[PDB]
């Protein structure tokens, strides 16, 4: 099973939750946002295959093709290697998308941008073909933005890695279905993007405090026979 391992160094994260007014955001980037980013990468890297009348259909077909290449509905997980904090901001997000209310109704609204210093993404594949391996490696790169246009994103290196069936704690995110048999963090995450579903994922984040601040440090989870190493240290990743 070829694993796409990439390091993302983006300062501020911007995808919000199922909410309004004050838009709470995810603690970790969602699989849907990463899937959309890779769909856009396929759009601007190989536009001959993906060329639709509207961008909505092109994005939908790219996401469908990616899911077809994906092992299962259970999508990619992420690994935060830096502490997480909630950074509430104020922006003039105009409220004009409702009925009436003229066309210029700008009000101050809250939308926090969690601060991240480093992050790792481990896409799980099913031994894809070589002729598309380099193309998808390049597409995984050049992810210039995540979430909204404000939150810039930038990669550093991407590579192909194998599990080699290593024993290590599962420091990634896994669906809360098989984890019953195994200081925990589970919530609805919206794995599947909606194009006109809601699966509870476990998050490896602890709100412990050492002296005065809590941030979000490691979780020290139970060991899993399935994992893979990088730069010496081994991360636990689940596969279906």
């Amino acid at each position: 099973m070829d694993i796409l391992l990439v390091c993302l160094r983006f300062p501020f994260f911007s995808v919000a939750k199922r909410s309004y007014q004050v838009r709470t955001s995810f603690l970790l980037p969602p699989p849907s946002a990463l899937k959309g980013a890779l769909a856009k990468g396929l759009i601007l890297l190989k536009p001959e295959k993906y060329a639709s009348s509207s961008l909505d259909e092109a994005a939908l077909k790219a996401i469908k093709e990616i899911e077809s290449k994906l092992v299962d509905i259970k999508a990619v997980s992420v690994a935060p290697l830096s502490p997480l904090i909630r950074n509430a901001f104020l922006l003039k997000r105009l409220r004009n998308l409702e009925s009436g209310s003229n066309a210029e109704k700008s009000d101050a609204m809250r939308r926090e941008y969690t601060f991240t210093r480093e992050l790792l993404v481990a896409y799980i594949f099913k031994n894809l073909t070589q002729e598309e391996k380099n193309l998808y490696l390049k597409a995984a790169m050049l992810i210039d933005v995540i979430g909204d246009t404000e939150s810039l994103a930038t990669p550093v290196w991407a590579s192909f890695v194998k599990p080699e069936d290593k024993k290590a704690p599962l420091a990634f995110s896994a669906p809360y279905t098989e984890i019953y048999s195994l200081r925990m963090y589970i919530e609805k995450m919206r794995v599947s993007p909606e194009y006109s579903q809601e699966e509870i994922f476990y998050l490896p984040i602890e709100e412990r405090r050492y002296k005065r601040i809590v941030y979000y440090a490691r979780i020290y989870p139970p060991e899993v026979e399935k994992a893979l190493t990088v730069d010496g240290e081994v991360l636990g990743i689940w596969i279906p």
Binding site: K17, S19, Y20, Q21, V22, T24, L97, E98, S99, S196
Partner: peptide
């Protein structure tokens, strides 16, 4: 109301606009 959670409100962006009434 908005007292019980600030995260709620009057509207919510579903796909291409807001949903009438109070969905939450």
């Amino acid at each position: 109301p908005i007292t019980l959670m600030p995260s709620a409100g009057k509207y919510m962006l579903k796909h291409f606009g807001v949903q009438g009434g109070n969905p939450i």
